[PDB]
């Protein structure tokens, strides 16, 4: 269903990444010279911060300047809505591509395909140019994008482009600030491949943990200090997985990069991305 009040679609996990990339590039938009992907929590609980607002505005400006693609949750919650709003604001002052991958199963309204349009769980933001919904089933709405998104990023990483130097490749930077658990899994899978994720030691909890770290007791104390209620609600079994993912992330530091809180410069975002690449 294509909706204009942009393009939308329903996806299956078995769909090949190469076919999706061919569709995207050939049909609609230009080749990507950069793939800044923001990972955060889908929960609506996103306490807006002043420095975070400035940082994300700078990130959007950089993405527009370089022509980068932006991949987000695209569910109109917390940081998602603001990261789309900055794109709108820049679009009203030569275009920004803000693909958003969400889950069909978790979506509330169903508008089957010509250009069916509806206005208004997990309603989806319409402020993103392109939306990709993937759910082979399971109306219970378990996360499904956590695989297709990573596969697409990896395939585009291997995609060779003879531009922007970088050895005929694409930057594919991985911005991470949210304190979600799925953010931890996303960071782990991103670092599994040679994707230079970058974190900021700001409001993010799972992000501040990694920023401070860069043993089991160390991880436990850090996550208790930064996520006391979350760890209290978390079961014992999940703690083993959390510690394992944290150890995997801290294993490699050449890919992971951090942003200091002291740095108040205007171009700290660009400095972090450039140093990571």
């Amino acid at each position: 269903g294509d909706i204009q009040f942009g393009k939308y679609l329903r996806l299956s996990c078995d769909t090949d990444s190469e076919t999706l990339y061919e569709l995207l590039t050939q049909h609609w938009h230009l080749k990507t010279p950069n793939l800044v992907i923001s990972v955060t929590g889908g929960a609506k609980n996103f306490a807006l911060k002043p420095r975070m607002r400035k940082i994300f505005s700078r990130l959007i400006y950089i993405a527009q300047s370089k022509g980068a693609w932006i991949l987000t949750g695209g569910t109109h919650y917390g940081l998602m809505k603001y990261i789309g709003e900055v794109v709108r604001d820049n679009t009203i002052s030569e275009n920004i591509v803000a693909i958003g991958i969400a889950a069909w199963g978790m979506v509330s309204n169903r508008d089957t395909l010509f250009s069916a349009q509806y206005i208004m769980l997990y309603i989806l933001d319409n402020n993103h140019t392109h939306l990709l919904l993937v759910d082979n089933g399971c109306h219970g709405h378990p996360t499904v994008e956590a695989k297709l998104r990573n596969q697409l990023e990896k395939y585009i990483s291997e995609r060779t482009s003879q531009d922007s130097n970088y050895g005929g490749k694409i930057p594919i930077v991985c911005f991470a600030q949210g304190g979600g658990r799925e953010t931890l899994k996303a960071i782990n899978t991103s670092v599994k491949s040679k994707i230079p994720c970058v974190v900021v030691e700001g409001s993010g909890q799972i992000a501040d943990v990694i920023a401070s770290l860069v043993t089991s007791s160390m991880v436990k104390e850090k996550l208790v200090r930064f996520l006391p209620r979350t760890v209290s609600r978390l079961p014992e079994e999940e703690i083993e997985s959390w510690i394992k993912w944290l150890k995997e992330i801290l294993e490699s530091s050449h890919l992971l990069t951090v942003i200091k809180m002291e740095e108040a410069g205007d171009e700290i975002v660009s400095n972090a991305i450039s140093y990571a690449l």
């Binding site: 679609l9 329903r10 996806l11 299956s12 769909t15 076919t19 569709l23 049909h27």
Partner: peptide, 10 residues
């Protein structure tokens, strides 16, 4: 045009 390709692809 494109929509027809989407039919089979997706």
């Amino acid at each position: 045009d494109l929509v027809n390709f989407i039919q089979a692809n997706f």
